[PDB]
Amino acid sequence: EPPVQVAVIGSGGAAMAAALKAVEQGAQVTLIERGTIGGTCVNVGCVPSKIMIRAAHIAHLRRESPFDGGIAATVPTIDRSKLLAQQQARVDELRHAKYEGILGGNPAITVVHGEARFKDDQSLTVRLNEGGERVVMFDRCLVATGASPAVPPIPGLKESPYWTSTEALASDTIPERLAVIGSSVVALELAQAFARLGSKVTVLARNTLFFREDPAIGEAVTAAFRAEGIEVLEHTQASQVAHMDGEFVLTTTHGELRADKLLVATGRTPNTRSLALDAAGVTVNAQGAIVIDQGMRTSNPNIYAAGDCTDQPQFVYVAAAAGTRAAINMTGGDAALDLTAMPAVVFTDPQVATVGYSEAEAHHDGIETDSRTLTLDNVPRALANFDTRGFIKLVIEEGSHRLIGVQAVAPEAGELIQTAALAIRNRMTVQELADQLFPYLTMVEGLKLAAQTFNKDVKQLSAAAG
Amino acid sequence: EPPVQVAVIGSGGAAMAAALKAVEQGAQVTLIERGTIGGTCVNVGCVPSKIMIRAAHIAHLRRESPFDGGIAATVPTIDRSKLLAQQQARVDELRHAKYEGILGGNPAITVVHGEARFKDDQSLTVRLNEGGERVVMFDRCLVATGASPAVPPIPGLKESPYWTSTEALASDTIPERLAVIGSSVVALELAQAFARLGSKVTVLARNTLFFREDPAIGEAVTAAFRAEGIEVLEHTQASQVAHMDGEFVLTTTHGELRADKLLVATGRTPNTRSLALDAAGVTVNAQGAIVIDQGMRTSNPNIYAAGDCTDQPQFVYVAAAAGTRAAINMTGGDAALDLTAMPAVVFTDPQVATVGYSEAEAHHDGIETDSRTLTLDNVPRALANFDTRGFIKLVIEEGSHRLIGVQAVAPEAGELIQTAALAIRNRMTVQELADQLFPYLTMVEGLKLAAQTFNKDVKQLSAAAG
Ligand SMILES: Cc1cc2nc3c(=O)[nH]c(=O)nc-3n(C[C@H](O)[C@H](O)[C@H](O)COP(=O)(O)OP(=O)(O)OC[C@H]3O[C@@H](n4cnc5c(N)ncnc54)[C@H](O)[C@@H]3O)c2cc1C
Ligand SMILES: Cc1cc2nc3c(=O)[nH]c(=O)nc-3n(C[C@H](O)[C@H](O)[C@H](O)COP(=O)(O)OP(=O)(O)OC[C@H]3O[C@@H](n4cnc5c(N)ncnc54)[C@H](O)[C@@H]3O)c2cc1C
Ligand SMILES: NC(=O)C1=CN([C@@H]2O[C@H](COP(=O)(O)OP(=O)(O)OC[C@H]3O[C@@H](n4cnc5c(N)ncnc54)[C@H](OP(=O)(O)O)[C@@H]3O)[C@@H](O)[C@H]2O)C=CC1
Ligand SMILES: NC(=O)C1=CN([C@@H]2O[C@H](COP(=O)(O)OP(=O)(O)OC[C@H]3O[C@@H](n4cnc5c(N)ncnc54)[C@H](OP(=O)(O)O)[C@@H]3O)[C@@H](O)[C@H]2O)C=CC1
């Protein structure tokens, strides 16, 4: 029973989880990474972005609050060089501790610095970063190559000095004027962060914000953004980009827009063109994403794929869960990833959080539904904070009354969404959820209150009644 | 089938919930209140305190943050007159909308302004606020008279101008120096609020903070308090209070302590001495609390009790839940209050939150346990915030591995505790909890990470792995 030889391409959340699990299951791992160890999350994604957003939150609350009648506010001076140094130090520390140190301190793992492609379904050719090549033979291989920022084909954009999320996060100055092309998670998390740290921000949204989500979400976020001075140009696209006399000049229907920096946040495409997937019989879809089943199996039985390079949702917790289960299956087990109560959080303020079905998604799947939308001016916590921006929306199956989805725009929406996720996992009805005790003056109490509106008027119920 | 005549004494969370439910069940309610409509929660409790604490939070973050290297901070000027006006306006608005307007706009409810006592088990004598008396006959009666701040018998205290929570919340100035006697929820929520709004605060704790809770809680809170300049004198009591030359002078073992204002927060005693409970055969315990079963039944079958005047936990959500169920039982039903997954939240920063059993409580009930304590320096969200004060502690039944309690000291602990409450309600094991997807970079993810440490090393696991 020789150790199974497992090859892993990448070192992000999917690859790390797979490598560690494979080792735990008795395999010898060869991990190939072309760039910085740790991939997107630690280096240019979740961690640095959430740090910058937290800095932004502090800046914002120093600038303004619902309590300014009685607490003086100031325009705080911002030293982005110091903020960036702090951010990078945590990134570097986490990469060393949770990635480099975990791979380096493990004798069942060989790390190769190079770019891999398939030679056949049992071997990779690696172009080594120090030059030349090496062949890596494997019994099983996990492709976990992630994704990269997409670039729309706008004339003049390619040759201009524009930013993706990577360059934005690595910037050592807050630009006076920031233009943002895009209208989803990356665009809006970063637009609000930059605005709060001092930029005059203009968002060019080709449709409306969060266009593919329940429309209540985009409506609430758009209003929030406008309320703190972020310009949101809906149904607006740039037809030309130019960079002249040190600034960006964007041609749009709304007229000419000028800015010091331009962030383009228009999706992330799977990193698969360099892999020679045809050499291993691994099928992709029209977007270039590797097609997998619930066991992370590709069209080739020796090759698995996990994370953003596949057709599954792009979140680090999905990538990791998928990597872990791919490893089980590569080492003789039988695991499947279940996404039925997969929550998602957008780190704007207020936060967006979702889990399960929107009304529209349920209808498209042939489910009969009812819903209730509780505005935050009904939530004691929001009233005590004097900030009632947002809502909590509950979606149920008609008849069974089973909770099947929740969408919320609220401060701490990301915290309360997990109570909704566990309710859905446990197949609870809204009456059962409403019957549980919740602490008074928490945002999560809003789930109880929303659940109660399926049977009675919120305005006619007394404090913590239920 | 004549309408059942239900009398309710009080107008707080228990009484309101009962009155409304009784009416919904077809009864005619006579509600007797000696003071301001709405009782403790709306007027002098939960609502005004959480408002003041939120004001304090803004003041604090304007003063200091983990991002001060790159974001300038100031000592904000505080106008407590304006803050108090804002606070009171929300209190007054909520009393009108959720209490007065709900009672006044209901023809099945008669409100009597006076102090009730029992004449016998079918009638009350009410001393009317406008003078004279009235007898109220009833079929069933709910006693929901709440509690009042307790006063320890310290020489000189009684005749000094000290504060309870009521006077503290109603104060129009921030005192330069505030002394606090007490070491539990009221003392510590208000001590930190006043400190953050500008007071130099000294807490006299007769033992340690949160003495009756898992000791990890008090340790974390004490450290937090000291870290922001609140003096915590453990194992310290005042043996004499004097008020001389405009200031309080407290004699203690640590020597003489002087302050401008003194808050005494040493418990809340049930309001039952004025009720003539012996006239109706209603038994109290040694503390004066009305003894009730899970159906809120007293020793007299026609008389029920709910909220802080009983021996059940003192929270507005318990009082309301109990009032609602008492009403069901007063109108021919069969309901019981289940407190097995009753969460609790303390609105310090970081928050304290608990649900279910501590290790000690489990052991005292004959349950065999294991536990894990995850320090917050292991939680991505806390690391991204550069604030790793606190912990998340999980308690399980040995063998079954069922989660039976959670104690947490963390920002947003009150939000994440509800996920723990639902896990416990649904009888989940820690492995089952750990197997659920949680969003990355939320505080609630900490529950997943803690759950995972029952089977493996946190430090050896990669980002969002599970
Ligand atoms: C700004 C930003 C913020 C985000 N915030 C969040 C968040 O808050 N929460 C959340 O859940 N998700 C977030 N995401 C998404 C999350 O970061 C990704 O879903 C997750 O990191 C994907 O992990 P992965 O392992 O699939 O890929 P990656 O982490 O991208 O790793 C893939 C690795 O493979 C390497 N590679 C590619 N091709 C080859 C090859 N041929 N040979 C060798 N090496 C190769 C790449 O260099 C890369 O290091 C964010 C993303 C961005 C961009
Ligand atoms: C500062 C503070 C902060 C708090 N914060 C929280 C929190 O964040 N969350 C939480 O869950 N709980 C909190 N509590 C506790 C919560 O407020 C109480 O548990 C809850 O309000 C109790 O409700 P109740 O209906 O039992 O009594 P109450 O609201 O006290 O109502 C009792 C009423 O009966 C009246 N009354 C008494 N005797 C008679 C009589 N003989 N005749 C006529 N009328 C009478 C009283 O005047 C009073 O209005 C807090 C308490 C305080 C003091
Ligand atoms: N908190 C978290 O969980 C985070 C997660 N992520 C992950 O990364 C993924 C990628 O994020 P993101 O880049 O925001 O992309 P998304 O795939 O979420 O959305 C694509 C965005 O690009 C717009 N778009 C596409 N093409 C064009 C074009 N030619 N011109 C103008 N706009 C265009 C879309 O507009 P329209 O909608 O109108 O079509 C939409 O706003 C996310 O979906 C998420 O899974 C990223 C950051 C944070
Ligand atoms: N967020 C929330 O849920 C809130 C809830 N409440 C509710 O109201 C209740 C009452 O709160 P609180 O007044 O804090 O009382 P608690 O009953 O929680 O605690 C009593 C406190 O008084 C101290 N004490 C008692 N006698 C003396 C004495 N002679 N000298 C010095 N100290 C003394 C105790 O010390 P030791 O512990 O050492 O014995 C302890 O600190 C709470 O238990 C809670 O149920 C109140 C505020 C907020």
Curated annotation (Swiss-Prot), chains A, B:
Keywords: Disulfide bond, FAD, Flavoprotein, Mercuric resistance, Mercury, Metal-binding, NADP, Oxidoreductase, Plasmid, Redox-active center, Transposable element. Disulfide bonds join 41-46. It comes from the Bacteria. The lineage of its organism: Bacteria, Pseudomonadati, Pseudomonadota, Gammaproteobacteria, Pseudomonadales. Its EC number is 1.16.1.1. The keyword Disulfide bond applies. Belongs to the class-I pyridine nucleotide-disulfide oxidoreductase family. Its cofactor is FAD. The keyword Metal-binding applies. Homodimer. GO terms for molecular function: flavin adenine dinucleotide binding; mercury (II) reductase (NADP+) activity; mercury ion binding; NAD(P)H dehydrogenase (quinone) activity; NADP binding; oxidoreductase activity, acting on a sulfur group of donors, NAD(P) as acceptor. It comes from Pseudomonas aeruginosa. FAD binds at residues 15, 35, 40, 50, 116, 308, 316. It catalyses: Hg + NADP(+) + H(+) = Hg(2+) + NADPH. Hg(2+) binds at residues 463-464. GO terms for biological process: detoxification of mercury ion. Binds 1 FAD per subunit. The active site is a redox-active disulfide bond. This is Mercuric reductase. Resistance to Hg(2+) in bacteria appears to be governed by a specialized system which includes mercuric reductase. MerA protein is responsible for volatilizing mercury as Hg(0). Plays a pivotal role in mercury resistance under thiol-depleted conditions and cell protection. Protects cells under thiol-depleted conditions.
